[PDB]
Structures are given as structure tokens and as C-alpha cells.
Amino acid sequence: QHVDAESIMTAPKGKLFHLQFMDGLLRPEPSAFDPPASGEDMRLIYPLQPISVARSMRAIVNHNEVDRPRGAVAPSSYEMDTGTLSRNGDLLYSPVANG
Amino acid sequence: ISVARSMRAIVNHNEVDRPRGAVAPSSYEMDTGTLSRNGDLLYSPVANGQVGIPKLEVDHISFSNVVSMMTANIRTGDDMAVERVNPDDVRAINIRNA
Amino acid sequence: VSGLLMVLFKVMTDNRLVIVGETTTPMSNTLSTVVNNVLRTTYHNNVGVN
Amino acid sequence: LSDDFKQISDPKGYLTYSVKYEDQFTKKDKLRASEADDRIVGPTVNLFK
């Protein structure tokens, strides 16, 4: 999808805009022999707030075969905690320490 | 005559005895040690103290070795290409000075 | 004797460059322990004999 | 009896994982789990490939 600056300045209030934002982290390095770019890719639209709130994980590939890529996101520990039922029935995370 | 022979009589006398004249494989056939500090193949050290003998130093055959290799094809297909750009005037070229 | 020269020649001119072929990464549990002690994570699908 | 509840098996959550792939990445080595470990671990692994 695309959004001209005109539309961003003139879209009615209360309409939900649907912006798109690339995660460029999984972009493999350019061939050594690709021609140089004389020009410059540019950008206008940015979020004011974090967008990736829904994101559990990111860049499930290896930098090298052993390093993590910069900006890679491991799953949160609580995604895997499956503790126990409370004395009354309610769900709980496992105790953090023995006490 | 049997210089080429690695092994012999791969069957059991009884179910547990070896047949007389049976030949087990030489240990070096299985040694697959390491690369030397410079790159060359070696047998494992014999004892804890001594360094491992180069495989090429001695007359044994070793049928396991560490082969270095690329992880994928080196012909990616991104062949180098250039922009040749000719002299503007053939008369103006400075042939001179080395 | 001719054979030996053409062996030596054919070796002096052996310009093969190895590339990793198809591999497998068996899980430890699939292998009997004696094999897992020899195996080092991945290995070529075309194991030779030994 | 009153139909107070909707008895069901193998429940669906309110939340689910979604996942976007860049298909050009693929590990060359091919992992071989036992069929059982594949039966359990597998649906996870196909998703987070």
C-alpha cells in the first residue's frame, strides 16, 4: 500500500489510516559486485510510539552460524512458564525463587 | 602379496573365537585426528605429552580425515562488471612518462 | 611404471575444491550411543565406509 | 438437561501466534527428529521455521 503526503494531510479525522512499516532485519548483504547506488532511498512517515507490541519473536535465522542478528527478539519467558493452579483454581506463573 | 589387504575373514570361528589368520583393520584407518597448526593432516597424539604425527609423514593409510570445504557454491553468479570510459581525445593522451 | 606417472600427474593436477553436500543432523536419541559418540552434529548424507 | 455449556475438545485460544517468513532463508542441514518428537515438537517447528 502507499500513502502520499497529500493524503496524510487531508484524510478525514476519525478514519483509521493503515500504514505499513518494513522490518529490514532479514535483508541479506548486497553482492560485492553489485553496482554502487548513486542515489539515496528516503522516507517521510514514522510512528511516534512503539509499533511491534504484538511481536513475540524476530529474525529466526543465524547471523554467521552462531551469532544472533542485531535486533533479534527471543520469546518472553512467560510464554513458556505453565506454572500451576492456585489454591483456589486460578492460573499462576512458577515461583521466581524458592521462597 | 597381501600388501593391499586391509581385512580378512570377516566371520566367526565358533561364535566368539577369531579364525586363525584373520586380519583386523589397522588403527590408522580410523584415527581421523586433526589439522596441524599450518593445515596439514595428523594422527591423534599417542600419549598425552607427545604431538600427533603428520599423516603424510608415515606409510599408513588413514580412511578418515578432516576435509575443509566451503558451505555453498562459490559461483554465486554475481560476476564483476565494470564501466570502461575511453579517453576523450586520442591526441590528448599522455603516452609519455613511463 | 607408466601408470605411476599418470597417477602422480593426475594427482598433481587434481584441482577439486570441496563444497558441502546434502547433510543430516540426527537428533541424539535416534542414534545408538556408540554412533552418537562418533557423530559430530551434522554429517554428509553420503557417508563413505569406514 | 439445560445446555449450559458447549462441551468441546482441543480448545482454541483467544490469542494465537502469527508468523511471516522470508522464504530465501533455509538451513542447508536437514534435521531428523524421531517420529514421536516430531508428533509433539513438530507443529511448533513448522510454524517457527
Binding site: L26, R27, P28, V61, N62, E65 | N73, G77 | - | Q24, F25
Partner: peptide
């Protein structure tokens, strides 16, 4: 049935390296 003898030798498999288009790392 008569007793018999046979031979075997390990097979060659040395292919030219495959040209894959996939890549494993970022």
C-alpha cells in the same frame, strides 16, 4: 545349491557442486 563368491567396491558419488539460491544466514 552351489557355494559362490562375489565382489564389491565403494561407489563414487562426486557431483559438481549444486547451485542453490537459498541462503542460511542474514
Amino acid at each position: 545349491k552351489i557355494a559362490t563368491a562375489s565382489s564389491a567396491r565403494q561407489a563414487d558419488v562426486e557431483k559438481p557442486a549444486d547451485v542453490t539460491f537459498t541462503i542460511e544466514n542474514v
